[PDB]
Design an enzyme around this catalytic site. Sequence first.
Site, PDB file in Angstrom:
ATOM      1  N   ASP A  40       0.825  -1.202   0.000  1.00 27.36           N
ATOM      2  CA  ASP A  40       0.000   0.000   0.000  1.00 27.36           C
ATOM      3  C   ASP A  40       0.865   1.260   0.000  1.00 27.36           C
ATOM      4  O   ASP A  40       0.836   2.046   0.940  1.00 27.36           O
ATOM      5  CB  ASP A  40      -0.931  -0.017   1.226  1.00 27.36           C
ATOM      6  CG  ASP A  40      -1.736  -1.294   1.333  1.00 27.36           C
ATOM      7  OD1 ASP A  40      -2.408  -1.680   0.342  1.00 27.36           O
ATOM      8  OD2 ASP A  40      -1.696  -1.914   2.421  1.00 27.36           O
ATOM      9  N   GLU A 216     -11.205   0.490  -3.436  1.00 31.26           N
ATOM     10  CA  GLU A 216     -10.508   1.040  -2.288  1.00 31.26           C
ATOM     11  C   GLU A 216      -9.312   1.893  -2.734  1.00 31.26           C
ATOM     12  O   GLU A 216      -9.258   2.336  -3.875  1.00 31.26           O
ATOM     13  CB  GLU A 216     -10.103  -0.107  -1.338  1.00 31.26           C
ATOM     14  CG  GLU A 216      -9.021  -1.030  -1.859  1.00 31.26           C
ATOM     15  CD  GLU A 216      -8.895  -2.324  -1.044  1.00 31.26           C
ATOM     16  OE1 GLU A 216      -9.292  -2.355   0.122  1.00 31.26           O
ATOM     17  OE2 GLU A 216      -8.393  -3.343  -1.550  1.00 31.26           O
TER      18      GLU A 216
END
Length: 535
Positions: A40, A216
């Site tokens: 991420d 997301e």
Amino acid sequence: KVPAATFTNFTYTGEDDIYAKNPLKPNEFYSPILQGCYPDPSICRKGDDYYLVNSSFAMFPGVPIFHSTDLINWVQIGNVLDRTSQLDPTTCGISAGIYAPAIHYNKYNDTFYMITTEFCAPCGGNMVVKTKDPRQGWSDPFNLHFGGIDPSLFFDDNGKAYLVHNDAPEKPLYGPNHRCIKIWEYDLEKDQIIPGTDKVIVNGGTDIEKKPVWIEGPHIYKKNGTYYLMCAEGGTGDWHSEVIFKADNIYGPYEPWNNNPILTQRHFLHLADWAGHADLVEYYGVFLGIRPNSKGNVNTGRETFMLPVDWSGTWPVFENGLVPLSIKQKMPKGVENKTGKDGFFPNGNFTYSEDFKSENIDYRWVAMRGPKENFIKIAKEGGLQMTALDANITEVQPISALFHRQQHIKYTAQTTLSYNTKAAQKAGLICYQNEACNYVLTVQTEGKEQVLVLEKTVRPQRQKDFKTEIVAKEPIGKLKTPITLGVTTDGLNYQFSYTLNGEKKNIGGPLDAAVLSTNFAGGFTGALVGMGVFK
């Protein structure tokens, strides 16, 4: 009191085929830029300076932060969440803790922001920390009052601030995979969302009819008066991708580019996989991916990859983000590859030998579920003096072990330790996926004699029960000298060894590498290698 051992050395050597078979030309660099568990990735810029951060789950300190002036040569300047007041993962689940980070620089108030979801104490949810200068550290958390994950702030040109995040829909249309992107106006004074300003700006994904999985990682950018929403879609596994939307207004209807996705590897079953969760900086885009082994397993976690981004038109294009990735990318004009040189973060195949002769321990070293300060001290002559905490290795508790991420599929590591015979405790070398998915080789005492014990604990995803087994055991007499322990993995199995008065001997046979994979144990993390003490 009295430490269990003093580890005088740790050596880690990466030995991956891909780098050996593809040597660099003078203007090239390896991608992923951060090898091992660095998922991420989020990136921001202030002036000449770039800052890059990653998720870290139950590791402490959490959220490592890298600095670079050229996007190729990075120095780890620390870890953003490095105080217990920011992060206290004592009883954190292995796949909980610190989720996707988003770092930002607000040029309007000359302030940095690190915003994330902390699924453990103290926050147990969405939170943000701030600083004027990352080198001085960050504030304590501001708890934010919304659910879901992947928070991300955006600062518009009229003094208004916004916050976008993933959330669950009121009315699920196709099960838990149905998710939403939600935006809020943000109060800069209070560091909190404004109630009543929430709006769903994407429902499901680029095309809801297709049942898009887990949209997301939302990020807002503004360019030539137009707003851009970039999101990950398809899940952080096999169907990972990145998609792009635009709007004429911050809340305004966000429409997907007919061309979507703009970044994926999902249509290949043949180097790299699970490509998505990107973030852009002025353009270059950093994202996450896995490099699986010959059996499709991943012991290296999700890594931070990079690609050049053309944004000369309406929409951002990831240069070759839709063809099979290669390990080599051309560097930006004028920049030379100093990876592994000076104080720069390594890449390719390399060796890291650490003697711990300095109280300022390298920022690559992490502990599980607590600070290393609770069980480590630097000896007067150097070395990791570490004292055993109460918890054994299989417990969801802080353990007295220092860990280095597995940055390669094929690696060889060793540690050298002086084993306190008075404390009689356990001291050794660990390969760790989770508390129930690990391999441990320890010197122990029985009588007035030391022994070496090799243990495994194996727990697949869906299984509740586990049991530590002794794989192998050998006596080594009365340890009157330092001892070296070693492990090597060929990508398929791990083989442990010990080296005493001259000679090196294997202990135990090949131990299945799959046991330390995400694939086998579930979760969001890569394997670790390190030294620890128990009993």
